[PDB]
């Protein structure tokens with residue numbers, strides 16, 4: 199029942215939000231205003247304060263995120279005013295610039311107009327605002343396989359990649375009323391990249407690996423008080439294992455472990471040599487070293503787990519239930535060296551939150 | 561309802577067991593016999609064939625075990641005939657000898673008389689038949705902290721440990737009718753141990769680490785067709801990470817990572833150096849090397865995961881549902897390098913199975 203689920207979600211959110219903001223006295227009148235507004239318009243508009251706090255709560259409730267200690271310092275940019283594709287493009291360029299902050303990454307979310315009756319106003323096709331293209335033509339793989347379908351969709355639309363292993367995908371999004379998305383090439387001056395080198399092993403540079411500085415997830419829906427912000431890209435800084443144990447290591451991604459084993463001078467022939475484990479450690483050491491040397495924000499998984507322990511402690515002190523997904527919170531290397539591995543977490547979904555949504559292509 | 565839950569479990573087990581054994585025709589008459597036997601005695605006795613297959617099914621259903629490919633080759637020793645503490649002691653000594661098999665470890669279970677009306681006939685106090693004692697007297701910790709409470713219980717009973725870091729705990733068990741357990745020192749000729757050395761790093765021997773060859777879990781209950789075998793110790797061979805990433809690495813166990821870091825020549829000062837990860841890899845390489853050199857069975861986590869993949873495939877081919885606990889099946893180092901990490905598992909409990917039971921001390 200559309201309006202009823204909206205009103206119910208609104209009631210719960212407004213009470214909780216205003217409680218946290220010390221505004222519990224204003225809850226009654228605000229709810230009155232909202233109920234009338236829904237009665238007449240079928241929806242309601244968040245105040246700037248509600249929107250900001252809602253986006254922060256949504257991060258705080260993200261069960262899969264180890265980085266939640268810093269939820270309250272999220273930089274929230276309200277772009278509910280955009281109406282044109284140039285305004286969207288410029289807002290996304292601005293997000294990249296302000297989030298990057300010359301390498302001292304600022305966790306940031308830009309919030310675009312929400313869905314009206316399930317009707318999107320802006321529909322972003324990118325998984326992240328900055329990501330590498332992927333290709334496969336008869337056997338040979340180039341670039342990031344995770345981007346293969348989006349890359350093909352872009353090329354259908356007249357974009358053409360250089361077919362290096364690190365082509366930047368264009369921004370691609372569709373406006374309400376348009377049949378086709380538009381795409382815009384990323385200005386390279388906006389995009390920080392870090393070449394991967396090793397602190398002790400000079401030959402590591404032979405692999406010619408690099409990665410981009412800022413992960414800006416752009417395909418999830420932010421839900422706050424029953425309002426669906428389907429277009430609301432957000433970023434943090436990387437935890438090193440995301441690059442070194444996933445993006446560059448996974449067989450279905452860049453698949454670099456055999457090449458790493460070769461440059462660090464170990465055989466990749468016997469499981470019992472633990473060469474994959476050894477290669478993973480050195481690649482992950484290289485990633486952290488390289489970001490630190492360049493002055494680009496990054497966190498290692500041990501430090502991240504320690505920060506998360508403080509998030510747990512803060513939640514208990516504030517009297518808030520803690521929720522988490524153990525399977526995503528443990529790091530993909532040395533998980534048992536973190537406190538996370540040795541406890542359990544309630545995987546209940548609490549709103550506001552960020553949610554998956556269907557891809558508009560494929 | 562005691563008898564009814566027994567009869568129901570018996571019906572399900574006998575049908576399934578006889579189906580798998582190609583004996584489905586005999587199900588009807590066997591069930592008749594069983595129902596009469598329960599009617600008169602309050603319980604029933606498994607045939608040797610039922611007991612053997614039941615113990616194998618129980619391993620096959622153990623959601624937390626990565627080693628299940630080899631479920632059908634379990635060596636089942638029927639000791640339902642024991643009545644004296646000397647017979648129990650001798651059976652446990654025999655299990656150690658036959659399971660060890662001069663280093664070519666045989667997965668084995670010895671099954672003692674089952675509970676009658678919840679009344680245990682034999683109650684084993686050990687967690688494993690072979691394990692090291694642990695102590696703490698005013699600040700200083702010696703040996704395995706996981707054994708502290710059992711060690712104290714043994715010493716209450718007149719045992720005294722030498723207070724090395726590797727004292728073998730005695731076998732300790734209680735017979736029905738006795739108020740106190742009895743204990744027996746392990747003959748050292750029965751116990752294989754492996755000194756830990758590193759394939760390339762000579763200084764690794766300075767740590768004076770060793771571990772025992774065979775993990776023989778002795779505190780779980782085997783449940784088959786509603787019969788509760790509370791005393792039924794079982795063993796496999798080790799996966800290397802159990803020793804190198806858990807027993808010797810955990811802060812609440814032997815806690816050796818800083819010492820490992822020192823002997824491999826790296827600083828243990830900065831999280832971003834990933835020294836814990838590097839130390840874990842070298843310690844785990846050392847463990848595998850040392851067992852292999854001595855001719856004691858062991859498996860690495862990559863090979864184990866590959867075997868488990870074949871277990872999954874075999875289950876599907878046989879038309880059996882697969883159950884598993886993802887949180888225990890992933891190895892504690894490089895979990896994302898295994899296929900296990902990238903799929904999900906149904907954690908449903910299926911019987912026959914092995915279950916936890918309350919400790920008789922503490």
Ligand code: HEM
Pocket residue numbers: 253256257260262263264265266268272305306307432433434435436437440444497502526552
């Ligand atoms: C500040 C630095 C941050 C770090 C280091 C961090 C770390 C991570 C990591 C490691 C993951 C899991 C990735 C994986 O499993 O491979 C994750 C997931 C997630 N993070 Fe964070 N995060 C940060 C900031 C943020 C921010 C600012 C938000 C939103 C406002 C956010 C929301 C999420 C969400 C929604 C997921 C789950 C994504 C999914 O289901 O695919 N994080 N984070």
Ligand code: HEM
Pocket residue numbers: 615618619622624625626627628630634667668669794795796797798799802806859864888914
């Ligand atoms: C043949 C070699 C075997 C290997 C390599 C193996 C491997 C393992 C591993 C790695 C674990 C998890 C340990 C941890 O999380 O730290 C485990 C758990 C388990 N294994 Fe196996 N296993 C083997 C044989 C057996 C046998 C023969 C049985 C029983 C007949 C068995 C039953 C179990 C059970 C019940 C658990 C869970 C124990 C608990 O809940 O504490 N395994 N196995």
Ligand SMILES: CNc1cc(C)cc(CCc2cc(C#N)cc(CCc3cc(C)cc(N)n3)c2)n1
Pocket residue numbers: 344413415432433434435436437440445525526
């Ligand atoms: C069990 N862990 C598990 C399981 C599955 C099935 C997927 C993933 C990874 C999901 C995922 C992939 C990619 C990429 N590329 C980026 C992300 C963004 C993660 C993220 C988001 C933000 C905002 C900051 C930050 N540092 N990191 C998530 N993990």
Ligand SMILES: CNc1cc(C)cc(CCc2cc(C#N)cc(CCc3cc(C)cc(N)n3)c2)n1
Pocket residue numbers: 706775777794795796797798799802807887888
């Ligand atoms: C998430 N993984 C997780 C979580 C918790 C809370 C505990 C454990 C470990 C349990 C455990 C501890 C110790 C010892 N010492 C031996 C075992 C026996 C494991 C075992 C049993 C057998 C038969 C063979 C074999 N190779 N290994 C289990 N794992």
Ligand SMILES: [Cl-]
Pocket residue numbers: 413440445
């Ligand atoms: Cl990423």
Ligand SMILES: [Cl-]
Pocket residue numbers: 775802807
């Ligand atoms: Cl063990």
